[PDB]
Structure 1
């Protein structure tokens, strides 16, 4: 008993919010993306391969969760955590007079355990 379910493309709304579909980093599942994207080197008579079963699309990182609308929506909620920079230190001439000491610290991030 084999079952073949149609993807989300036929059910995607025209004005549906995209961050709701792609909130975090995803492996770019073709069933959740209604955009027909062809990636790959074309053939002499053929065309670049579609999004179904295309390994090249899964290889590349996808920024579908970082669309400008989602960036604006996320950054709007982050205004509550940030603090205001004092306007009295706009120019470095007064910064040198007030806090002459500079402390350089190095921080690194790397993928792995």
Structure 2
């Protein structure tokens, strides 16, 4: 069957094509991007069947349009810094104690 990038318009809503982190789909990404060390009198390989493009952690789901649209919807969740605390001079005056704690984000089951 023919790839659906042939049906994608030049003014589509790209974030709706890649909402979340997804692997590179050469039938969904409408770019003639090539990757690979070319052979003698050769060219970098095409995307269809390219394992190297599939090995990249692509940022197609985070484009500037998508990021701005995300961060406009996430503003509802935020609070405001008390404006009285303009600088560290007052952060060390009104709140003498500082508590430092760390979180770690790895990949795995645990």
Indicate whether the TM-score tops 0.5: yes
Structure 2, unmatched stretches of 5+, are none
Between the aligned partners of 1:10 and 1:102, the Cα distance in structure 2 is: 57
Q: By how many angstroms is 1:37 displaced?
A: 0.5
**Counterpart pick for 1:22 among 2, 18, 30:** 18
Q: By how many angstroms is 1:107 displaced?
A: 0.5
Q: By how many angstroms is 1:8 displaced?
A: 1.2
**Are the equivalent residues in 2 in contact too, given 1:9–1:31 (CA < 8 A)?**
yes
Aligned residues: 109
Matching residue of 2:32 = 36
**Runs of 4+ that moved beyond 2 A:** none
Q: By how many angstroms is 1:109 displaced?
A: 0.8
Structure 1, unmatched stretches of 5+, are none
Q: By how many angstroms is 1:10 displaced?
A: 1.0
**Are the equivalent residues in 2 in contact too, given 1:8–1:33 (CA < 8 A)?**
no
**Structure with the largest fraction of helix:** 1
| TM-score for the superposition, normalised by structure 2 | 0.97
